[PDB]
Amino acid sequence: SDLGKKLLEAATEGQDDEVRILMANGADVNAHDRLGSTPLHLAAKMGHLEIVEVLLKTGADVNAEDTAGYTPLHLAAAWGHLEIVEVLLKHGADVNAQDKFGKTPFDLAAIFGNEDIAEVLQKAAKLN
Amino acid sequence: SDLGKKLLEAATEGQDDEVRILMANGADVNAHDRLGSTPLHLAAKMGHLEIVEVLLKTGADVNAEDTAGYTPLHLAAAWGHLEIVEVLLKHGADVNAQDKFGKTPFDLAAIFGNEDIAEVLQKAAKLN
Amino acid sequence: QTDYRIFELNKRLQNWTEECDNLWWDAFTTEFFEDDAMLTITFCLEDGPKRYTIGRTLIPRYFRSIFEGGATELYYVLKHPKESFHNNFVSLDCDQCTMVTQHGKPMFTQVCVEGRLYLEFMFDDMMRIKTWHFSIRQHRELIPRSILAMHAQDPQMLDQLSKNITR
Amino acid sequence: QTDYRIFELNKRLQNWTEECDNLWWDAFTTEFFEDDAMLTITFCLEDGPKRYTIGRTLIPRYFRSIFEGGATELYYVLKHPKESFHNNFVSLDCDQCTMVTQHGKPMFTQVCVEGRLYLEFMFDDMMRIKTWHFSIRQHRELIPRSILAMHAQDPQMLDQLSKNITR
């Protein structure tokens, strides 16, 4: 779909108003690019908090997997976006989510030295 | 000529006996490669004293110029072969010889840090 | 052949500036890696045996973290890499790969990570990288002489300079 | 395009050993330079303005002297080289060329000669170099931290290490 492509792009580029318009015209919130990335993967990794918030309240799937098996929380975890990691955990992001290589968001935070986020993810995991 | 090519090669590779045979069969002592190098240029640069000596006593041209304007003395000077530089000066090597870029054997010895040779060439140049 | 690919990868890297936006990293990764590419780092066995593998969607993140780490330059020096042909893929196995990063002021530290780089390229799928496995043997940290010189009469700073960044 | 040529030149250099005989230098020079090639070095203007040009028959001598000089490795890092097309020749003008040599024990000194490299390649005369002009702006001498560390409490050696090789 063209509409889906435009929404993926708007989310990546941080275009709050364009995301609003595309959704209003019926752009699929759960559209996928070449790499299986959803608008929420792209907004999360690029630090676009407001788009992450709108997507989650308009039905975006919080535990969507890309081709590599990564969730939006993996991506926010890897790229050091603390507010986004929190918004994802509030809306039911799975801390035990594993990529193709069996890595959790925790291990990704560990690997890229994102200390605050690794701590939040450790406390999250203990609580059922 | 094939014979000339074989002689250029024998001189380069330090093959004393092969040089003897080729000369005995009438190999041109003043044969030239692609780059205008004579057997004496090649023997001089590769440190082959005995071939340098035989070539000079069988009519080799001591001040032969390659395509770049270098003499055997330029090449011996550059490559730090002190005995060969001396044998060339004894057989009338021109210390004021200039390449295309107006460099003498002296300047080449200077450039490559061949100190002994640069000194010999300075003393040579003062004497007419 | 696969060598020119790592030529092109090094040359594109030589265009990095702090202005290099998140889109440039995606276009760099698209130029050189397959859509299902996988990147593994194995660390030296002295501070334990550590290994991570990341999927295609975080390969941009990996490269970018080297510059976030303070690198102003990155290039890979491959020494007589062994190329091998399979049906669907070409392998490049370099047991003398040096990963070179320059850092800025004040120490202008150059870091040299020596190890074995094993790559799998997809056979005319535009010669993009399917597998990247870097196994680190050792590293060197280089100091400009001018920085040594300015602290030569300074035990405090010589203590600072005498200690490695990582190990 | 001309860039892959300096790729190939660096890669061939990465095969140098002390066993690399006088014939290997001629085959290296034949692979990369025209029969009438010319190589010019211009030095930094602090210890005077010095310039030499050598003809094709001593280009082997030039490269070889770098290893005789104690280099164990040589490569050229070109940063966004400007390529220009003329009728009979292609020009490559790199104002950020780093000539990198590693040296061995005891100091494992790395020397980095930064300057502008201007090349002229003959237009499909096998893309061999007709002109090589390296103008040196500055240089850096790098010391491994481990060598700093071993002499850190040694004023004598710190004096030794604090002085440059050339300038």
Author numbering:
A (entry chain D), B (entry chain D): 219 to 346
C (entry chain A), D (entry chain A): 30 to 196
The paper states:
The Chip/LIM-domain binding protein (LDB)–single-stranded DNA-binding protein (SSDP) (ChiLS) complex controls numerous cell-fate decisions in animal cells, by mediating transcription of developmental control genes via remote enhancers. Chip/LDB and SSDP both contain N-terminal dimerization domains that constitute the bulk of their structured cores. We recently discovered that Chip/LDB and SSDP form a stable complex called ChiLS (Chip/LDB-SSDP), which binds to NPFxD motifs within the nuclear Wnt signaling factor Pygopus (Pygo) and Osa/ARID1A, a chromatin-binding subunit of the BAF transcriptional coactivator complex. Here, we report the crystal structures of the DD of SSDP and XLdb1, in the latter case with the help of DARPin (designed ankyrin repeat proteins) chaperones that mask a hydrophobic surface patch of the DD required for its SSDP binding.
Screening LDB orthologs from different species, we found that Xenopus laevis Ldb1 (XLdb1) yielded the most stable protein after removal of solubility tags. XLdb1 is closely related to human LDB1, but we did not succeed in obtaining diffracting crystals with this protein either, largely because the DD and DD-LCCD undergo nonspecific aggregation over time. None of 35 selected nanobodies facilitated crystallization, but we obtained DD crystals with 5 of 15 selected DARPins that diffracted to 2.0 to 2.59 Å, depending on the DARPin. Remarkably, each of the 5 DARPins (despite their different sequences) recognizes the same lateral surface patch of the DD, perpendicular to its dimerization interface and facing outwards. This patch is highly hydrophobic (e.g., Y81, I83, and L87 engage in direct DARPin contacts), which explains why its masking by DARPins was crucial to prevent nonspecific aggregation of the DD via this patch (called “hydrophobic patch,” below). The DD adopts a cone-shaped α+β barrel-fold, composed of a long, highly curved antiparallel β-sheet (formed by β1 to 6) whose cavity is filled by 3 α-helices (α1 to α3) that run roughly parallel to the β-sheet. This structure is capped by a short C-terminal extension at the apex of the DD, formed by 2 intertwined α-helices (α4 and α5) that contribute to the dimer interface. The whole dimer interface is extensive (burying ∼1,500 Å2), which explains why the DD dimer is highly stable in solution. However, none of the known DD folds contain an intertwined apical extension, as seen in the XLdb1 DD. We conclude that a lateral hydrophobic surface patch of the DD is crucial for its association with SSDP.
